[PDB]
Design a protein. Structure first.
Length: 104
């Protein structure tokens, strides 16, 4: 936590709340099934979870997704994908992704 002259970025706020329950109670690798057109959390090479929308599901090992937080695409397995909580879901914060408008 931060007290005194604090302040962050919209995304940093939501992500900050999720990263917590996500880093303390990480999802089960290979539990959530990514479906074409479904929102979920993806694990970044830096073991950092981020909001993304399944673009194309190839195989349990290959899942085309797009980070709706930055605006990038990465083919990750169904292991790095998990159930995106409604509390941290974009439903509260708008996708800061750049290539989001084109994502879908």
């Amino acid at each position: 936590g931060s007290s005194g002259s604090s302040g962050g970025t919209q995304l940093e706020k939501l992500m900050e709340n999720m990263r917590n329950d996500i880093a303390s109670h990480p999802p089960v690798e290979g539990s959530y099934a990514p479906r074409r057109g479904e929102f979920c959390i993806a694990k970044f090479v830096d073991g950092e979870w981020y909001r993304a929308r399944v673009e194309k599901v190839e195989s349990p090992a290959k899942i085309h997704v797009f980070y709706i937080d930055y605006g990038n695409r990465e083919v990750l397995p169904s292991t790095r994908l998990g159930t995106l909580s409604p509390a941290f879901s974009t439903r509260v914060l708008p996708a800061q992704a750049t290539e989001y408008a084109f994502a879908f």
